[PDB]
Amino acid sequence: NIPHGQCVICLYGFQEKEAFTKTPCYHYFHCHCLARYIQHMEQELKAQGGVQCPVCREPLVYDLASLKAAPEPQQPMELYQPSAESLRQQEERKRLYQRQQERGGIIDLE
Amino acid sequence: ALKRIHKELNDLARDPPAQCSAGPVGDDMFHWQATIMGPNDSPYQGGVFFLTIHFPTDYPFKPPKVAFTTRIYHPNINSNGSICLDILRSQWSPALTISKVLLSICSLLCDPNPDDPLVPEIARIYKTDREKYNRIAREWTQKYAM
Ligand SMILES: O=C([O-])C(=O)[O-]
Ligand SMILES: [Zn+2]
Numbered sequence: 001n002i003p004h005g006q007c008v009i010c011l012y013g014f015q016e017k018e019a020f021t022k023t024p025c026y027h028y029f030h031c032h033c034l035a036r037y038i039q040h041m042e043q044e045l046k047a048q049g050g051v052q053c054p055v056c057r058e059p060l061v062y063d064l065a066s067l068k069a070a071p072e073p074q075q076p077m078e079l080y081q082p083s084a085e086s087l088r089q090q091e092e093r094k095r096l097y098q099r100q101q102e103r104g105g106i107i108d109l110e
Numbered sequence: 111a112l113k114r115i116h117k118e119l120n121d122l123a124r125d126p127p128a129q130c131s132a133g134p135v136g137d138d139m140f141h142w143q144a145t146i147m148g149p150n151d152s153p154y155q156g157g158v159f160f161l162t163i164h165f166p167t168d169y170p171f172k173p174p175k176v177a178f179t180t181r182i183y184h185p186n187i188n189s190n191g192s193i194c195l196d197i198l199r200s201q202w203s204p205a206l207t208i209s210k211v212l213l214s215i216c217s218l219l220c221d222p223n224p225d226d227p228l229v230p231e232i233a234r235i236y237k238t239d240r241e242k243y244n245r246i247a248r249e250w251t252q253k254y255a256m
């Protein structure tokens with residue numbers, strides 16, 4: 001069936017029509033997400049020289065080509081819409097920041 | 111990166127780590143401002159500390175760049191606001207989130223790692239004279255962050 005949790009790479013959950021995979025350490029990722037992770041990690045390890053699970057660090061077994069072949073998940077971007085309360089809190093923050101500026105408390109990095 | 115950034119932003123707006131906040135600077139989703147309230151178990155108690163976050167093109171596979179904007183007296187944070195924290199370099203994973211990074215920084219404020227300092231003088235004071243360390247950290251907090 002389909003896992004109830006969320007792919008920690010993209011932060012979306014799993015849908016019945018999506019291509020996802022499960023590691024031998026019992027962690028689920030969309031194939032596309034895990035492929036990007038592995039490609040990146042392979043480049044990084046090379047530039048300093050064992051790709052590990054992003055969740056628990058167990059070394060992964062995988063075939064990169066097989067993960068890449070899978071369809072990228074179709075995921076609508078989640079709109080950002082600040083609550084009235086956050087906008088209020090943001091205003092109080094501006095006030096605090098202004099005081100810090102006046103105090104010489106803000107690092108510039110000219 | 112953008113879809114991931116929107117996800118985090120929303121997950122943070124509705125359930126921020128205790129005493130923290132974070133959101134975009136103007137219209138730019140790749141540049142955020144965050145705040146941390148100084149932890150009560152730290153000499154930063156009572157202060158409010160601003161941080162800047164810049165996300166790299168290949169986020170979340172490369173770590174966000176996080177720095178203090180509010181001046182702070184700490185062995186692992188320098189006068190440029192740079193932060194020496196393993197999860198921001200060698201121990202980054204896309205399983206981490208800004209929310210988790212903020213929690214980790216709060217922990218760092220309560221419990222510095224003086225054996226990996228960005229500021230050797232402060233690290234020396236921390237290890238040899240904690241009374242003095244805490245006094246000065248409180249003094250900077252009161253002058254700059256309160
Ligand atoms: O750094 C300062 O200016 C202070 O400690 O008073
Ligand atoms: Zn995913």
Ligand SMILES: [Zn+2]
Pocket residue numbers: 023025026027053054055056057058
């Ligand atoms: Zn795992």
